[PDB]
Amino acid sequence: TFRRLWPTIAPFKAGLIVAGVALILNAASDTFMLSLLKPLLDDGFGKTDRSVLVWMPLVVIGLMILRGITSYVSSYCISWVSGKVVMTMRRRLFGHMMGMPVSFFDKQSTGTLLSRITYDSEQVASSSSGALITVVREGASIIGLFIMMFYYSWQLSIILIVLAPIVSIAIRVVSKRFRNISKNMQNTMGQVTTSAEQMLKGHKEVLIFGGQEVETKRFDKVSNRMRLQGMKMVSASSISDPIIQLIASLALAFVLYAASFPSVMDSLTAGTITVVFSSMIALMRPLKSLTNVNAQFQRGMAACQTLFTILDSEQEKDEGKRVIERATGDVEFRNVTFTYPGRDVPALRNINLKIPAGKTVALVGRSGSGKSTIASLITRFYDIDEGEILMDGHDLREYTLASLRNQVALVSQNVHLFNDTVANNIAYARTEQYSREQIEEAARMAYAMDFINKMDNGLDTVIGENGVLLSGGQRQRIAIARALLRDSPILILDEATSALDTESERAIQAALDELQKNRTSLVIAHRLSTIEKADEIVVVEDGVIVERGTHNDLLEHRGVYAQ
């Protein structure tokens, strides 16, 4: 309808101009091909000229080569534009996609948004370009064919050129009728498919009550309804083209009957009627396809509207102002109420968890209460509804978001690795500011240089997708070195199962826990020997604060520590 992706086309318009020129010249090539007929039939195969037949094979092969060359060039130079705007659209949408908060990736999954990166973006320039190609080529072919009509036979030129828009209208209303009946009937077909959907929704409560025999009879009736619906749908679909063919055949018969009159006859040669008839037959495909121009132009821009709404949404709120260099001081929580997104149930009560500087605070929960939820707030993934976290004696909403996530470091076994090299991965987003020797020695105090050696190249190898495939413990052995290099003010550690690295990876996490000896540690781990070693322990459950003290002090009302 009304699209403002044209600025993204605005510098890339030379490709459009070249494609349009090549396409109108393709239409002219088709016109000249059809123009070839009259000398062949009138001069060539009528009067035995014998030179016409000599030089026509050459020009027809030349014109077919001209059709081929111009079609290939037009397709290449329109897909150049459809690639150079899809690339720009992908770049912009990707930027605003990584801009937006984590809630956007949730409730949508990482598979759909990829389709909105490649599927929707392709349709943006595979239905608009697919509309421009038609409206130019087959829209100017009609003009060329009517110029043929004016040139070679003016007598019936008037009759078919006045008749043609009426035929276009006929095809338009027939297509509209087909579209309407198909739409309403397709809604009905879905409305009966939901019956099968419900029937297969419970395979339970059919085996229990023992109703297999009854549950096929009803499905037999539903299948019969579906069959009748499908037969009516095909009838409606395959009556459309026949009636169109009949109304256009009335035009063909009208032209031929008009030719009966003496005045139009005897001025037109045997070849002239030939070219006008064959051209009229050729007119059907452009005349039919021009009507569906708006259809395809509203199947590419329609998806583009959804893509724009994805683009035009709001990035995460960044009213923060105070960049914090290093948050070594105490971190305090203050009457913070958080609600998980998409749910009215708050997963967090009014929580006051205070993290002492350089100390350990450990959360032990197997219920899935939200130990990860509280881990989210300190990194400001999901924001805070009411209350405040005095981060080194200052609110998060005062702190800039980039600075805040520069302070914190989240270590886990679900760590994702980019398609980079190992050296650029350890010093991620700061490899310019961190040296190679720093990365190496950081890996060394992170006691993780072993597997780094054991692959092909070592200090400069790829850590890419479908490449080395480090185990979860080994990926965490990269992750600990990341925060070790970065000198994170806060190191909120997670944990999962480990075998043959419980001896290693955890006692190496002593080396990250040397940064616990140097910095705070909001450890989220759920089972380890270090859990009892943890200085301060909280056992927060169902989003509720439960108990505060060391494990021996915590053993009082404790009934879950046993594991």
Ligand X SMILES: CCCCCCCCCCCCCC(=O)O[C@H](CCCCCCCCCCC)CC(=O)O[C@@H]1[C@@H](NC(=O)C[C@@H](CCCCCCCCCCC)OC(=O)CCCCCCCCCCC)[C@H](OC[C@H]2O[C@H](OP(=O)(O)O)[C@H](NC(=O)C[C@H](O)CCCCCCCCCCC)[C@@H](OC(=O)C[C@H](O)CCCCCCCCCCC)[C@@H]2O)O[C@H](CO[C@]2(C(=O)O)C[C@@H](O[C@]3(C(=O)O)C[C@@H](O)[C@@H](O)[C@@H]([C@H](O)CO)O3)[C@@H](O[C@H]3O[C@H]([C@@H](O)CO)[C@@H](OP(=O)(O)O)[C@H](O[C@H]4O[C@H]([C@@H](O)CO[C@H]5O[C@H]([C@@H](O)CO)[C@@H](O)[C@H](O)[C@@H]5O)[C@@H](OP(=O)(O)O)[C@H](O)[C@@H]4O)[C@@H]3O)[C@@H]([C@H](O)CO)O2)[C@H]1OP(=O)(O)O
DSSP readout, 523-562? E---S-HHHHH-SEEE--BTTB----B-HHHHTTT--SS-
- Strand-pair partners of 272: none
Q: State the binding site.
A: 365-372
Structure tokens at 137: 């080529």
* Minimum distance of ligand X from residue 54's CB (angstroms): 14
Q: How many CA atoms lie within 13 A of 521 on its CB side?
A: 28
Nearer to ligand X, 33 or 181 (CB): 33
Q: What Å distances lie between residue 240 and 11, 186, 230, 232, 375, CA to CA? A: 43, 17, 16, 13, 61
Quick one: angle between helices 270-282 and 284-291, nearest 10?
20
Span of 241-249, 351-359, 480-488, 513-521 interacting with ligand X by CB under 6 A: 241-249
The answer to whether residue 219 forms part of the interface with its own copies (CB under 8 A) is: yes
Q: What span, in angstroms and rounded, lies between the C-alpha atoms of 434 and 430?
A: 6
* Minimum distance of its own copies from residue 360's CB (angstroms): 20
* Minimum distance of its own copies from residue 37's CB (angstroms): 8
The answer to whether residue 99 forms part of the interface with its own copies (CB under 8 A) is: yes
* Minimum distance of ligand X from residue 93's CB (angstroms): 27
The answer to whether residue 185 forms part of the interface with its own copies (CB under 8 A) is: no
Structure tokens at 253: 């018969």
Span of 17-25, 203-211, 240-248, 355-363 interacting with ligand X by CB under 6 A: 240-248
Nearer to ligand X, 33 or 390 (CB): 33
The answer to whether residue 429 forms part of the interface with its own copies (CB under 8 A) is: yes
The answer to whether residue 325 forms part of the interface with its own copies (CB under 8 A) is: no
Structure tokens at 403: 């600075």
The answer to whether residue 64 forms part of the interface with its own copies (CB under 8 A) is: yes
Task: Looking at residues 7 to 46 of the shown chain, list those that interact with ligand X (rule: CB under 6 A).
Answer: 30, 33-34, 36-37, 40
* Minimum distance of ligand X from residue 415's CB (angstroms): 45
The answer to whether residue 187 forms part of the interface with its own copies (CB under 8 A) is: no
The answer to whether residue 548 forms part of the interface with its own copies (CB under 8 A) is: no
Residues 279, 148: contact at Cβ < 8 Å?
Answer: yes
Structure tokens at 541: 């459950």
Nearer to ligand X, 265 or 402 (CB): 265
Instruction: Count other C-beta atoms under 10 Å from residue 560's C-beta.
Output: 13
Q: State the binding site for ATP.
A: 365-372
Task: Looking at residues 439 to 478 of the shown chain, list those that interact with its own copies (rule: CB under 8 A).
Answer: 465
Binds ligand X by CB under 6 A, chosen from 221, 285, 322, 436:
285
Provide the pairing of β-strand 360-363 with 521-523: parallel
* Chain centre to alpha carbon of residue 128: 17
The answer to whether residue 277 forms part of the interface with ligand X (CB under 6 A) is: yes
Q: What Å distances lie between residue 161 and 157, 168, 511, CA to CA? A: 6, 11, 86
What is the size of the binding site for its own copies (CB under 8 A)? 135
Residue 285 binds which of ligand X, its own copies, none (CB < 5-8 A, kind-dependent): ligand X
Span of 177-185, 256-264, 435-443, 524-532 interacting with its own copies by CB under 8 A: 256-264
- Give the residue from 124, 112, 134, 40 showing the smallest Cα distance to 85: 124
Residue in the block written with tokens 């006859």: 265
Binds its own copies by CB under 8 A, chosen from 158, 200, 295, 510:
200
Nearer to ligand X, 163 or 443 (CB): 163
Residue in the block written with tokens 């008037």: 158
Binds its own copies by CB under 8 A, chosen from 95, 393, 458, 467:
95
Nearer to ligand X, 43 or 395 (CB): 43
Residue 284 binds which of its own copies, ligand X, none (CB < 5-8 A, kind-dependent): ligand X
The answer to whether residue 259 forms part of the interface with ligand X (CB under 6 A) is: no
- Strand-pair partners of 536: 361
Residue in the block written with tokens 């087959």: 138
Q: What span, in angstroms and rounded, lies between the C-alpha atoms of 174 and 433?
A: 68
Rg for the chain, CA atoms, rounded: 36
Residues 78, 72: contact at Cβ < 8 Å?
Answer: no
The answer to whether residue 249 forms part of the interface with ligand X (CB under 6 A) is: yes
Residue ranges binding ligand X (CB under 6 A): 30, 33-34, 36-37, 40, 60, 160, 163-164, 167, 241, 245, 248-249, 251-252, 274, 277-278, 280-285, 287, 289
